[PDB]
Symmetry: C2
């Protein structure tokens, strides 16, 4: 394929995407196809001769799209968002065009330096402690990772290596086997499953300690567990706190956990994957309490920043601790698991610049406003109740009565495919999570979701016989 054919293919693809995104709420958010549908539609060998890009592009709509759940839709309410943005799509495409890999400065200087610059930009925008800036004096800095799962994994592995070095150096009569077999780490029982999986991958136990009734993990619980461990001759390694839990968007108490952690020399990592965005807002300032005291923190730009999926930010208070475990312009291949790296800073930069900090703040505030609107609908309706206080873009609620009303209502909504929600459960009680996900989400979209929900409960209950 030569350049002209590329200009034409690419231009038609730009048109295709613009028109997919502008018109997205006209399509069912959930797909109607059965597992295996695609396998049946597509050949079993790659074509021997080259196919025309018009035919391929037409196939996108014919056989791919029907098998998509549309994440970019205002009607997607199921999980924390990916919602991308136009500039982000252009930036990623540009990056793909350069096709450069940043495993060292000379592999391309701009890859690395632009990462340094946008991570500092983001740290200022999120009102993060100064020491998280590269430009700052000190070893602190941020790095773009693939996902929050990877950032959590990095922090856990780094803490495990620093622990087994600080200990074994302190007590060389002990073998690595013994020390490593004595390591223990902690988190909330409300933490994301990526914490657990990191425990498995790190070969280190992660105790999921009970959060309160309010889904908040607290310093006294952690202290208790750590004393229980230390007393037993075990070595406390890292605590992974969560700001913005998956279930209710609960916030662990970082001040008390922090005091405890400094006490016992425990690494404290904060998974802010979703709620990190709200750090940018003065009215959310409470969410930043204790941040000047933690070791590392992650936030997913795709979740709140309108940078398309991939793109997790991780700031370290002291990067040496990672670099020493895995092995002035930073050498980022040492701040990460893999060796090569994509040029992810490009799309981030393009998005920050074309949106502006004002646009970013407005975007977060708009999600908060839409969720507030939804909550008002839940509150006004005598047949529904709130299960948790509203937080950011998330409202947890259920129809009053038995869990099975929740289950049946959700099944009806699933089958209709007009909006997408998932069920959750806490202390035996099942509920529905409504999250505002849209690139384009408007008040009328919230009204649409509520009408759909409210309707389906009306019919559900009008059928009971």
């Amino acid at each position: 394929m030569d350049a002209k054919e590329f200009r034409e293919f690419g231009k038609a693809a730009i048109d295709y995407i613009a028109d997919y995104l502008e018109n997205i709420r006209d399509d069912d958010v959930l797909p109607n196809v059965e597992p295996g549908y695609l396998l049946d539609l597509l050949p079993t060998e790659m074509p021997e001769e080259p196919e025309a890009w018009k035919d391929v592009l037409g196939d996108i709509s014919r056989v791919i799209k029907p098998g998509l759940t549309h994440w970019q839709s205002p009607h997607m309410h199921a999980y924390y968002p990916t919602s991308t943005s136009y500039p982000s799509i252009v930036g990623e495409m540009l990056a793909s065009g350069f096709g450069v890999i940043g495993f060292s400065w000379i592999c391309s200087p701009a890859c690395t330096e632009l990462e340094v610059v946008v991570m500092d930009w983001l740290a200022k925008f999120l009102k993060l402690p100064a020491h998280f800036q590269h430009a700052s004096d000190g070893p602190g800095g941020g790095v773009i990772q693939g996902s929050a799962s990877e950032a959590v994994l990095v922090a856990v592995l780094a803490a495990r290596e620093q622990a087994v070095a600080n200990y074994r150096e302190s007590h060389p009569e002990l073998s690595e086997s013994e020390v490593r077999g004595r390591l223990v780490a902690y988190s909330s029982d409300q933490s994301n499953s990526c914490i657990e999986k990191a425990g498995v991958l790190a070969a280190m136990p992660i105790r999921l300690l009970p959060a309160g009734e309010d889904f908040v993990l607290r310093g006294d619980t952690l202290r208790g567990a750590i004393e229980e461990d230390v007393a037993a001759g075990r070595i406390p390694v890292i605590c992974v706190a969560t700001l913005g839990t998956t279930g209710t968007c609960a916030y662990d108490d970082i001040e008390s956990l922090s005091a405890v952690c400094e006490e016992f020399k425990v690494w404290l990592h904060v998974d802010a994957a979703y709620a990190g965005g709200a750090f940018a807002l003065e009215e959310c300032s409470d969410l930043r309490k204790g941040l000047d005291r933690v070791d590392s923190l992650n936030f997913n730009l795709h979740k709140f920043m309108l940078v398309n999926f991939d793109c997790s930010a991780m700031w370290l208070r002291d990067a040496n601790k990672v670099v020493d475990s895995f092995n002035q312009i930073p050498d980022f291949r040492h701040w990460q698991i893999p060796l090569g790296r994509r040029f992810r800073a490009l799309k981030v930069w393009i998005t920050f610049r074309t949106l502006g900090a004002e646009g970013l703040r407005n975007h977060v505030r708009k999600h908060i406003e839409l969720a507030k609107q939804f909550e008002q609908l839940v509150l006004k309706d005598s047949r529904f109740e709130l299960v948790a206080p509203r937080a950011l873009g998330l409202v947890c609620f259920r129809p009053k009565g038995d869990n099975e009303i929740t289950t049946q209502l959700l099944q009806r909504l699933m089958d209709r495919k007009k909006i997408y929600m998932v069920k959750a459960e806490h202390a035996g009680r099942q509920f529905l999570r409504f999250v505002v996900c849209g690139m384009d989400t408007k008040a009328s979209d919230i009204d649409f979701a509520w009408q759909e929900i409210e309707s389906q409960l009306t019919d559900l209950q009008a059928e009971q016989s």
Copy 2:
């Protein structure tokens, strides 16, 4: 930013990329800028109001491009390729437009099913054993990973978990601490650094066993080491063999390593990251010896398949072994380290279809032809010698005489920035690696590189005083 502004931005970006790529050999492949150049050019805060995309796009050329090493250039000879392709850039952009995440089937069915289909396509094209196909009876199948570092890490971690389960279940009097502290794994001393780093991350020793003079690791060496270990009460876990070593593109002997590995119940993973592409060629059939006997294998599509960077394929003989360690349509989040996944199959599919298997084969054969041309130049010149036999797109060679002639020649080439090569070293002897990397690479490009090299040695030697 609304849709019209996106159509215009995106279309201009398509033009920008097409014209960057068609005209790329007109620019120096290596950048002339100093570390810190970009930090100095760019503001220290994100703009508060939104910037115009024309201004941003113009800045790409002004401040980004000067800080790029141009990987897509025919004049990039330094490392195994990333070379992307036009259709791949369009596909990735399309994927970004959907902005979907495949952490489960329903998160989008097409994400997963298309992955199944292109991994099978690729397995047939690479003449891989049938059992590596999803469609095949049996638990075998492939999965797209982020990089070869990740695929190697996955295989090592999976092998470590299966080992500590199979053992501890066999001898429950032993604690996990003891078993885990007794684990040992193996590789070549010529293996990629990602093997070593995987050892560190996996908390498992990886013995880099001496390859022969020919840079090939052999079954007898592995047997020796494993017997040395077993005798000492240690548990052999995994051997990571390499087809296509970084230094010389050497090939470990997979048949003997295989026999040894089956003997001791050792997981055998093959890192084929680069040379995997040549599996598609009948004249390369020897490279596939023993493949029906290994556990898992990785190949980087970006290296030989013209799919842009990211995109490593990993096939498992039995996927249960990974799935059981980390935790019919496969559930791919279990075949991997992270939880969410990008829709990477889309660009792969678009590239396979628009290129054709014929185009892919021609591409690999063309690299082989260009390297053969280069080697002929080295051989005809009385002042240069071959350090290793030519393999695929790689020729290792040096100017005759002391290592310092190699060093000085490389420094001259670096300073000129017309072509990019790196130095290597084996058994005290330093040499130059010439790899053909180009999307567009032509015979005249090979002639260009040789003229540059040959010239610079002539001047180097004509200066000595």
